[PDB]
Amino acid sequence: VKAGRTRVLVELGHYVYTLHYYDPQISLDEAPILEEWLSKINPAGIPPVP
Amino acid sequence: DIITRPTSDSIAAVANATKPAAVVSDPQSM
Amino acid sequence: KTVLSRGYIDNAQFNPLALRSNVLLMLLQFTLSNLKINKSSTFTSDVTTI
């Protein structure tokens, strides 16, 4: 997915969402945020979507 | 403060049994 | 080596001429060992996604 070769659709009914505000003048790659989010998913529950 | 109560012990026990590791060391990512 | 084997055969052998009796006794012990009541226990549901 990180490479431009795959697109994934995750079917969620409803979920808690959180969001971060960045500066448009600062280039960045947002992969670490998702990886952190993935790092805390388990069959018991999930953290809020960033 | 908020109202919250511990879940029944039986449920907690079985729930904690099935908790796979989220991140694991795999020598392959190609 | 339940019977007919105490002081007649070696520790590393088995009597081939008394096989039926020994097998029968072994099964009898197998049977007697399982005489129990399958008691119930605490059933519960799982909140896990599985």
Q: Which two tokens stand for residue B30?
A: 């190609």
Resolution in A: 3.3
Cβ atoms C17, C3 nearer than 8 A: no
Q: Which of B7, B11, B18 sits opposite C50 (nearest CB)?
A: B18
- Residue B20 main-chain phi, psi, to 5 deg: -65, 155
Q: How far apart are CA A10 and CA A2, in angstroms?
A: 16
Does residue B28 sit in helix, strand or coil? coil
Please name the residues in contact with A22: beta carbons below 8 A apart, sequence gap of 6 or more. Answer: A28
Q: HEC states along C17-45?
A: HHHHHHHHHHHHHHHHHCCCCCCCCCCCC
Is residue A43 less than 8 Å (CB to CB) from chain C?
Answer: yes
Does residue A34 sit in helix, strand or coil? helix
Cβ atoms C26, C2 nearer than 8 A: yes
- ∠ CA C13-C17-C22, nearest 5°, is 75
In terms of CA atoms, which chain A residue is nearest residue C46?
A44
Q: How far apart are CA A8 and CA C13, in angstroms?
A: 65
End-to-end CA distance of chain A: 17
The amino acid present at B2, given as its one-letter code, is I
